[PDB]
């Protein structure tokens, strides 16, 4: 039966855009978008064996059916349609799309090799969408981006009943975000690894609570799939089958020096001094008294140094960092102040968000939901 429907332009264009996000760059049928008109409305879906996205939109179905059409072209067309209802009609091998005085005739793709969407696993728990986007955004910045070390390209998701912990690392920084969710099924104790680029994109797209589907019982993760369910939206992501490194042991129990300072002021001053850093390699940080002196430079390009007042306890310390790793971390705190936890110039520094608010030390590690652990670079 030939599909035929009318739909509101904004509803259609949004949904198609959303699906076309997780659509592959280039088997050519996989970049197709599937339109199915049902008794309830229009389903718009895309799948590429790794990631699937399905959205349900209101529509006036004059004639039920389905059709596969090129995903990119459909997205481009729908973004540029005028302020008029959209009417879609399949007639033979063509799909016709009319909107006001505009008429598009597109070839239909072949279904005979178009794979059915995977079923989502059973529900595991529910997170408010704004929290989910923040946490995922925070840890994703530390994820590795090199497919030759696949374990690093995932976000580690560990579940302990009502507690969820997200972690990511690329060997130079480690991001760890703890949060609370409401479990839906039974109380659950498992860990899973999810492709970070995918998961960060889904979270960043937005939702208005997010239902995560990893399964339940002791069978959590057995489908090898992360399902994400939202109002009118369903998506799946293939889990990563790779052992994640043991990161928790890297979080120091105490520090020999700590430092507290405004995020915005530090970030601005870093960027300013780093302008003269050779190939953006390193920025130097000297802590002493109530002063932090940043410095950077190169032989043939020039030198820079800048002073900032700081809340600093412990013995004077000079430690160096990759400026970008550093501002990446600062930028992901989402707080006014940052607290640095140090030991030596050769050992990881702890960045935690501070709130509005002594002695010689050593200093107990603060308890926070979020931490960014940054490896220093060697001073020349």
């Amino acid at each position: 039966t030939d599909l035929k429907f009318r739909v509101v332009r904004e509803d259609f264009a949004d949904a198609v855009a959303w699906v076309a996000r997780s659509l592959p760059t280039r088997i050519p049928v996989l970049a197709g978008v599937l339109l199915t008109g049902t008794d309830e409305g229009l389903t718009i879906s895309g799948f590429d064996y790794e990631v699937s996205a399905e959205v349900k939109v209101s529509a006036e179905i004059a004639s039920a059916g389905s059709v596969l059409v090129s995903g990119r072209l459909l997205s481009d067309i729908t973004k540029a349609l005028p302020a008029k209802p959209v009417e879609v009609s399949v007639e033979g091998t063509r799909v016709s799309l009319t909107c006001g005085s505009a008429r598009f005739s597109l070839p239909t793709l072949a279904v005979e090799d178009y794979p059915a969407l995977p079923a989502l696993p059973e529900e595991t728990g529910v997170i408010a969408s704004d929290l989910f986007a923040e946490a995922i955004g925070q840890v994703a910045v530390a994820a590795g981006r090199d497919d030759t070390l696949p374990m690093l390209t995932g976000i580690r998701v560990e579940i302990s009943g009502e507690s969820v912990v997200l972690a990511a690392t690329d060997r130079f920084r480690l991001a760890v975000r703890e949060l609370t969710w409401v479990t839906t099924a039974g109380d659950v104790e498992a860990a899973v690894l999810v492709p970070a680029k995918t998961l960060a994109e889904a979270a960043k797209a937005g939702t208005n609570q997010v239902h995560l589907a990893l399964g339940s019982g002791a069978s959590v993760g057995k489908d090898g799939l992360l399902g994400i369910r939202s109002e009118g939206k369903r998506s799946t992501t293939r889990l990563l089958d790779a052992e994640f490194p043991k990161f928790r042991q890297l979080l120091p129990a105490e520090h020999t020096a700590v430092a507290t300072i405004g995020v915005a002021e530090l970030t601005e001053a870093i960027k300013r001094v780093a302008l003269v850093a050779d190939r953006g390699a390193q920025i130097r940080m000297e802590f002493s008294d109530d002063t932090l002196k940043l410095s950077a430079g190169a032989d043939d390009v020039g030198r820079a140094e800048e002073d900032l007042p700081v809340d600093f306890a412990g013995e004077p310390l000079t430690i160096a960092f990759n400026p970008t790793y550093l501002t990446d971390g600062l930028g992901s705190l989402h707080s006014e102040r940052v607290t640095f936890g140090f030991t030596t110039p050769s050992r990881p520094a702890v960045l935690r968000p501070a709130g509005e608010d002594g002695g010689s030390g050593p200093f107990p590690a603060a308890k926070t939901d979020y931490v960014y652990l940054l490896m220093p670079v060697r001073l020349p």
Partner: peptide, 10 residues
Amino acid sequence: VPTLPLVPXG
């Protein structure tokens, strides 16, 4: 440019 003391990983 040392790495984090991840074990394994460095």
